[PDB]
Design a protein around this ligand. Structure first.
Ligand SMILES: Nc1nc2c(ncn2[C@@H]2O[C@H](COP(=O)(O)OP(=O)(O)O)[C@@H](O)[C@H]2O)c(=O)[nH]1
Ligand SMILES: Nc1nc2c(ncn2[C@@H]2O[C@H](COP(=O)(O)OP(=O)(O)O)[C@@H](O)[C@H]2O)c(=O)[nH]1
Ligand code: ALF
Ligand code: ALF
Ligand SMILES: [Ca+2]
Ligand SMILES: [Mg+2]
Ligand SMILES: [Mg+2]
Ligand code: NA
Ligand code: NA
Lengths: 342, 333
């Protein structure tokens, strides 16, 4: 997938966490928000590079999905033969087929929410274990709506909007504000709701999907250049698979190749600052910023333990080994600080 | 244009009101509502068949336009603000809507509730008021204040809360029908759908592997009076000055190709016919009052027994009664 760059850094963090006995630095949750069918699940799964989320027109995502990516060491390690999933609701059942993971999301949605468009705020909890992922929580959410359909109650719009707000009001979250390119940017429900919790735009990244669907005689140049609504952290255009492409089983590799080609053809002057890989790179920088910000806390915690183990060292071997491990941890922090991504 | 069918009906309705000496009723205003750039101005002007309304992506309509079609007794425009100047050039009318919008709303995306008043005089129109409105929005841009969304929404409500209005609830086909701001707001003022007609624009822009069949068959959101799909000009087509005739031809062809089983109940001509039927319903509702008025004057003139005048009016009242019956029996297409 496109978000592997941080793996060596988080491996170093894990060494420090193992010594200090706590996972002291937690990366912000990445949460997708926007109007129904704006392409949110398509964006969120593109950061995984595996097709694990149900997608489609009409309402598809109908419960929150808390997707916890869990990095797996070479010790705990097992193509598709290296990665697996577990749901809380299916206990210790292991899923190796990502199509089956997708189907189980649909299954578990239907169990709680019914089969006629109903929505539930109860999250589905999924862990994906892989040597190719960092420790990161991605949150998929139903899109905003206007008119109740199927089983939905009269106040469905507010139910969804309040559900979204509960997730994005978390200060340690990055908001992917998703708006479709075939709508005017000023109509972005994603940007409206993001500004309610993040008025200064410190943790909101604008994604413009469906660039390929724009009416002839129109384009997103002004949008992508920040000339309509400015978005501090970035406005990044993507081209995910059409419904036809999903029906035709078009691969992730081909989706990305066609996105790249599309941007070269229609947005050549902006192409190197757009696309799915660029979205991933931008997110990586935000995640690294959080790590750097938290290093002083981590260093302080190391020192608390170092002084404490030095005191036990007037169990005497226990203290000595820990002191050396903590010396190592202090060295690792400086290394992480001075690491810059390519 | 596609809305000429009512001409002969209103002509005889006018004859009846003249005979009774009463003011002819006002047909309900037809008001277009929906999200910004859903294609509202494109829909509204298609009822006239002349290209008089500024259209485009981003915010274009920034003031209400009260477009009064005026039937000319045996085509030209007049704006209330340019007094007696008569416009025969419809591109110039369109440009003047843009100019007048800038005069009041400024040149940086601001919106004003002050209406532009335009009359279009034609022998091929019925006396009808069409109201064009800015679309609903979410994030302020340019000069717009923080509460621009509420300002636009309350502006729309000021128009459609009028019980004597028909609401054209416009939703783009390349959005999910459940996200229709037009239908949400319509249901607020017209909860039982007695005066809301749903238009689905931009069928041609739907993602490959998707279509509007379920939407157009009432299987997503039911809309009592109808859900009618249309294909208006793309921005490219507008830039290239593609004609109304060509737009309509291609819309017809698109519906035959992609919606053959539904084509006869969709498209701009069918939208016009559906609106004509709704307007006829309103006309029929005015007739009982007219009937009672004739009967009052009849017994009034029959008591009078100067003489030729009373004998003529007694026959003219009989004629008016007959015309009322005819109006009730008239089929429109
Ligand atoms: N053509 C095109 N279709 C897209 C794009 N992104 C999403 N879609 C389609 O949009 C529909 C909704 O996508 P989905 O991810 O389920 O939207 P969500 O409801 O916001 O989670 C599906 O039919 C997708 O195939 C895009 O960039 N281009
Ligand atoms: N392809 C296509 N474009 C349309 C259609 N209807 C409107 N448009 C385009 O949509 C944009 C907005 O149209 P407009 O009537 O100004 O929208 P309004 O803001 O709701 O009044 C313009 O660029 C039109 O060319 C349609 O049926 N098909
Ligand atoms: F399936 Al959606 F917003 F329509 F996630
Ligand atoms: F020009 Al609009 F809604 F964007 F009428
Ligand atoms: Ca080392
Ligand atoms: Mg989704
Ligand atoms: Mg308009
Ligand atoms: Na959807
Ligand atoms: Na517009």
């Amino acid at each position: 997938g496109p978000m592997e760059a941080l793996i060596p850094v988080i491996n170093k963090l894990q060494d420090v966490f193992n010594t200090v006995g706590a996972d002291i630095i937690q990366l912000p949750q990445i949460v997708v928000v926007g109007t129904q069918s704006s392409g949110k699940s398509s964006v969120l799964e593109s950061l995984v590079g595996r097709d694990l989320l149900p997608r489609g027109t009409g309402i598809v995502t109908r419960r929150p999905l808390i997707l916890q990516l869990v990095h797996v060491s070479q010790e705990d390690k097992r193509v598709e033969a290296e990665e697996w999933g577990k749901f809380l609701h299916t206990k210790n059942k292991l899923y190796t087929d990502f199509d089956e993971i997708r189907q189980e999301i649909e299954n578990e949605t239907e169990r709680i929410s019914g089969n006629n468009k109903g929505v539930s705020p109860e999250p589905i909890h999924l862990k994906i274990f892989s040597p190719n992922v960092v420790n990161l929580t991605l949150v998929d959410l139903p899109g905003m709506t206007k008119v109740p359909v199927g089983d939905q109650p009269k106040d469905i719009e507010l139910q969804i909007r309040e559900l979204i707000l509960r997730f994005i009001s978390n200060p340690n979250s990055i908001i992917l504000a998703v708006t479709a390119a075939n709508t005017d940017m000023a109509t972005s429900e994603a940007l409206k709701i993001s500004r309610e919790v993040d008025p200064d735009g410190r943790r909101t990244l604008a994604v413009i999907t469906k660039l390929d669907l724009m009416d002839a005689g129109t384009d997103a140049m002004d949008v992508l250049m920040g000339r309509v609504i400015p978005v501090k952290l970035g406005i990044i255009g993507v081209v995910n698979r059409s419904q036809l492409d999903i029906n035709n089983k078009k691969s992730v590799t081909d989706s990305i190749r066609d996105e790249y080609a599309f941007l070269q053809k229609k947005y050549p002057s902006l192409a190197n600052r757009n696309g799915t890989k660029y979205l991933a790179r931008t997110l990586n920088r935000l995640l690294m910023h959080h790590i750097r910000d938290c290093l002083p806390e981590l260093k302080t915690r190391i020192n608390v333990l170092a002084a404490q183990y030095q005191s036990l060292l007037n169990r005497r071997k226990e203290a000595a080994d820990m002191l050396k491990a903590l010396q190592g941890a202090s060295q690792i922090i400086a290394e992480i600080r001075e690491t810059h991504l390519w």
